[PDB]
Design a protein around this ligand. Sequence first.
Ligand SMILES: N=C(N)SCc1ccccc1Cl
Length: 330
Amino acid sequence: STGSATTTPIDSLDDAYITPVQIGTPAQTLNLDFDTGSSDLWVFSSETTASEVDGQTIYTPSKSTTAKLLSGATWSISYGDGSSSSGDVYTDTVSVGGLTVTGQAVESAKKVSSSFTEDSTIDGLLGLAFSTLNTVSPTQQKTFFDNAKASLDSPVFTADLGYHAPGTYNFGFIDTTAYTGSITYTAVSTKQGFWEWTSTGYAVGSGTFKSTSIDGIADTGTTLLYLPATVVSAYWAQVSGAKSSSSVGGYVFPCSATLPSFTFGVGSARIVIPGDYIDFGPISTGSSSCFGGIQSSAGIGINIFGDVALKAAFVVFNGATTPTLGFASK
Ligand SMILES: N=C(N)SCc1ccccc1Cl
């Protein structure tokens, strides 16, 4: 089997991407944030605190003939921006782009924090990191991919995120029309539960390539590119007027700037992030100070190849016995 679903930016800045997901019988379609940095599928629901829901679409398990409460199971998770959600669990039928999994754990939100409530475009998350990070207690649950893996033509999924445009998530196959050149595969460590790999270096604009190992994660659920302070200083030093601002929370630059590209290494191959991809617009409405898309990971504890980087490539999450990651230009 295979699945193929379109993923759409939630706003003009590609702050995140949503993908429609069918849950239950009859189907209830919710727009989820596919997150290769976590391993929980949770949704806004009929159980969510009423005051904490504002325009999201909710899952109502009582209207689904295939929903079953997973007795005694609870869950609780937090994300990079300090948001969080928690609740109980049902099992139900979940389909993504024509690919169906029965008995998927669907984690039902009783509580979400304000950032979730405040974002009406995201109805929940669908985690695609390794199942060892799943938060369900006392019986940890598997991710949609892990449940589907045995059925897939090939035990892979691919992320093809657009720049200010829709993209695609495919399950079970690699679309050879979706990329240029060849795919370069690189080793993955799963010891922290992430799609953790090691980049071979970087370049800033038309600058020479610096060979240096940068360990980090491939994370569709992080918007920006978070890299060591040395690397990020080297980038912003090429932009007149750029500066790191503690009040704003990172590097900002004159909105009048033309940004240089950023290249990252994958084995002997190179992925180029166009400068426009690194522009996240005014820090506040009407401001002429713009927020940078490359930021320091100092303080986070890990480097993060977020959407800014992943959208410059066609990315293969290979969930074979020994998982690997593949990157091609497109
Ligand atoms: N992708 C996620 N759900 S968490 C990504 C992240 C953000 C900040 C600090 C660490 C991580 Cl792993």
